[PDB]
Amino acid sequence: KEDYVKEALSVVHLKQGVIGIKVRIMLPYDPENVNGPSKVISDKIKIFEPK
């Protein structure tokens, strides 16, 4: 959770009142951290191939 979802809060003041808009976004896994977390989610596993 602390790696993969980054969440935001911005508040809006209008004629009528206050509006709060929360945006929470899941990140894609990428080994280079420019796009997302390097370590995978713990439940996901990889199996190699027998041939």
Partner 1 sequence: RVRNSNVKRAAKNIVEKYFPKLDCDFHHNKRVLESVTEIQTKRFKNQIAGYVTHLYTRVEKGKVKKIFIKKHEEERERRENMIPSSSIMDTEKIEVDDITMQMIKDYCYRGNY
Partner RNA sequence: GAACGGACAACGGCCGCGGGAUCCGGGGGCGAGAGGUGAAAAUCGGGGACCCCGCGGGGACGGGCGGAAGCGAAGGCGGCGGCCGGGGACGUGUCCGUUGAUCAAGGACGAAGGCCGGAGGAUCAAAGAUGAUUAGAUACCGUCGUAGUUCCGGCAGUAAACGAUGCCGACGGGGCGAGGCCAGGGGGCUGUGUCCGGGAGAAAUUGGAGUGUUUGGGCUCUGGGGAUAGUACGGUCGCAAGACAGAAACUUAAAGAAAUUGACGGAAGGACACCACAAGGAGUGGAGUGUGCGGCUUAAUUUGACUCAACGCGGGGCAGCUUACCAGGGCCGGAUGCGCAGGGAGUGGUGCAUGGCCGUUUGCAACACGUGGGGUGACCUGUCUGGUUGAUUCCGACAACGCGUGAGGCCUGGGGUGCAGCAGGCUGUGCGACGGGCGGCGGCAAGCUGCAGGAGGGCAGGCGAAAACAGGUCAGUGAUGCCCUCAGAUGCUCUGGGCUGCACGCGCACUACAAUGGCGCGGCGAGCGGGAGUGCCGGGAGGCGCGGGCGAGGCCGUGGCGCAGCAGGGAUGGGGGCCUGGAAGGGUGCCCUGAACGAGGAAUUCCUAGUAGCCGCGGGUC
The footprint of RNA on residues 28-47 (CB under 7 A) is 41-43
- 8 A C-beta contact, residue 7 and residue 25: yes
9 binds RNA (CB under 7 A): yes
CA–CA separation, 27 and 43 (whole Å): 16
Contact map string, positions 4 to 43, toward partner 1, x by CB under 8 A: -----------------------------------xx-xx
SS3 state of residue 9:
strand
> Where on the chain is the footprint of partner 1 (CB under 8 A)?
39-40, 42-43, 45-50
